[PDB]
Structure 1
């Protein structure tokens, strides 16, 4: 959090919604002529084939599994949250410009954790890294670390040297610093501070970080936490809520982006229900280990 304005994140990525839709359409027209065949899925022989868009594209169903597998490798290796967040940012910025039906996902996850841990000054050697990626997944990863580091080379090639990225956690620390002032004089309980930190940790899914500044995401998760803590006669009682409403109004952090972030959190927690490991894990198994 040096200065997000006049950084590289505000300039050469973080495009608007129409530009992201146009780039996704260019990705779709790129993968159109690649394989019009589809996928030969077999279990009971049984061989139906999807259309190019029934699923296993970048809409929703595998992103939760992607975040779960990144976090599993993270807490297995026991590295801090900023490295896994930067690895998830590299994951999304690579899958925007390349498909997933041609790239081994587990090596991409281990490669992104490797590159983010190296660039955010908390290094992990390649021996223990590929040994953990083998001891958690005994398949889908070669013993050669050279293939992992050639993946590292092409990952550095694709996201063209834009490695460092500001995080919403620093702006959350700044907001909870400024909320201890004589204009407001409030402070959350430590369980709701952990709830807001967990919501920020959960919002790295669902494709929001490529559109808005991170302080808007921090304000959105803190608003969801405060307005979901306040109610569990008068309507807007518990004046922590009142001081937060006056803070969000009197400061000119704008609306209509926080609305989209809250609606995106609602649709993420809606899409979490119809999610199962079985179909996507079997689809990966029949997409790589045929």
Structure 2
């Protein structure tokens, strides 16, 4: 956990954008690119809601989200039902991040109540899986991620950066919230977390009309990659405005490829 450049995250799970888009083609016969992105946001929101119900800290939710994104970056939406995968990712992340093993009753109650209370526009029927399904999906999730469990996030480097600036109280809460928002995109699959952090800090400086051009100039980082991430962030807030998940998600879910049954 101390060295990103030697990590499985860096060496296996920083993916090329073109390969990522190439893999997704299998699912895009059913969904537009736009609808695929919406579905990814939706499931990010589902995982955030599951984590909130279980009272898990943000790092656990973030790790779960990365497992979900990694899984469907390699495999089809129809390979394993994402409705099972989302709580399975939370279950595994809780172990990895040292919260512990969520009890049978708490996990199923969380999935049931969350979909019922907060996502009933997309889920007319109750959560249909039991704990045995979670456990079975957990084994599959573990092997299919090649046993890569330690995930680096932008929160730690963000904190170090704001502290280096001497602007913790001023910039942190906005920058942190922007980091949360980046989980609505593919950025965690595409860029080192410190670069995501810098981009988020930058957007927060823009929003708060804080000039910090000097401090950013004194960093030895690929500014062109940072600018790429900044453009993704600005773009996610335009998509946010235009997306109504409550009005749109039922139709998008019905277009999602479903697992072929056994013959």
For residues 188 and 121 of structure 1, the distance between their equivalents in structure 2, rounded to whole angstroms, comes to 27
1:201 aligns with 2:157: no
TM-score under structure 1 length normalisation: 0.77
Q: Does 1 or 2 have the higher relative contact order (CA < 8 Å, sep 6+)?
A: 2
TM-score under structure 2 length normalisation: 0.85
Q: Which residue of 2 aligns with 1:71?
A: 48
For residues 47 and 213 of structure 2, the distance between their equivalents in structure 1, rounded to whole angstroms, comes to 35
Q: 1:202-281 to 2 correspondence within 5 Å?
A: 202-230=181-209, 241=211, 244-276=212-244, 277-281=246-250
Deviations 1:2-50 (A, max 9, x none): 111112211122123233334435xx2xx69xxxxxxxxxxxxxxxxxx
DSSP-derived class of the 1:60 partner: helix
Of 136, 145, 153, the match for 1:150 = 136
- Select the structure that is richer in helix: 2
Give the number of aligned pairs. Answer: 247
For residues 248 and 19 of structure 2, the distance between their equivalents in structure 1, rounded to whole angstroms, comes to 31
1:128 aligns with 2:138: no
- Which segments of 5 or more consecutive residues in structure 2 lack a partner in the other structure? 117-124, 259-263
- Which segments of 5 or more consecutive residues in structure 1 lack a partner in the other structure? 33-51, 181-186, 231-239
DSSP-derived class of the 2:77 partner: coil
For residues 251 and 183 of structure 2, the distance between their equivalents in structure 1, rounded to whole angstroms, comes to 25
Of 130, 138, 145, the match for 1:159 = 145
DSSP-derived class of the 2:4 partner: coil
Deviates most, 217-226 or 276-285: 276-285
Q: Which residue of 2 aligns with 1:105?
A: 82
DSSP-derived class of the 1:93 partner: helix
